Amino acid sequence: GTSKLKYVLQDARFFLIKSNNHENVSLAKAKGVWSTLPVNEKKLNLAFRSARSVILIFSVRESGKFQGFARLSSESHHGGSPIHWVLPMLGGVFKIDWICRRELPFTKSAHLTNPWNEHKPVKIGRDGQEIELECGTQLCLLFPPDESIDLYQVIHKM
Ligand SMILES: CNC(=O)c1cc(NC)ccn1
């Protein structure tokens, strides 16, 4: 079903996360963590205090796909366990709960445009680009269901 998913996404905010490599998305999926540049860290912390759910939608650059999406479960914090990101300077660490670890090809989202990025297709956007509520909700609902996920515990964090 999609009903608990819709509940988690009701009045959520959505952000496009672009990773230079698959390894960082894999660490994020394994450890439930993300870290970004301070300009985006400040935006995510503001959004986390302002919305019932803040959703990060991940895309590896040059992959032509999204690799899943996740909900912020905390603001960023420093001094936790170190994360061996593959880098080419990162802020704190956000804890995240994954909502879907399955891929979605950009060919499947070509009908969705993001008003906050000049109504360009939602796949287009810099790291940290906010996706407007309706576009972001329909993008998340496009993903194949991830039957390994139970949103019951995520609902309890809202
Ligand atoms: C896990 N976080 C990253 O890989 C990242 C890298 C970056 N510049 C290379 C900017 C924001 N985030």
Swiss-Prot record:
Changing L56E: Does not affect ability to influence alternative splice site selection. Tyrosine phosphorylated. RNA binds at K18, S19, N20, W34, S35, W85, D127. Residues 12-143 form the YTH domain. It comes from the Eukaryota. Changing F58D: Does not affect ability to influence alternative splice site selection. The modification Phosphoserine is found at S81. Disulfide bonds: none annotated. It is found in: Nucleus; Nucleus speckle. Changing L44E: Does not affect ability to influence alternative splice site selection. Changing S59A: Does not affect ability to influence alternative splice site selection. Interacts with SRSF1. Interacts with SRSF2. Interacts with SRSF3. Interacts with SRSF7. Interacts with SRSF10. Interacts with CPSF6. Interacts with KHDRBS1/SAM68. Interacts with TRA2B. Interacts with KHDRBS3. Interacts with EMD. Interacts with RBMX. Interacts with ZCCHC8. Regulator of alternative splicing that specifically recognizes and binds N6-methyladenosine (m6A)-containing RNAs. M6A is a modification present at internal sites of mRNAs and some non-coding RNAs and plays a role in the efficiency of mRNA splicing, processing and stability. Acts as a key regulator of exon-inclusion or exon-skipping during alternative splicing via interaction with mRNA splicing factors SRSF3 and SRSF10. The YTH domain mediates RNA-binding. This is YTH domain-containing protein 1. It comes from Homo sapiens (Human). The gene is YTHDC1.
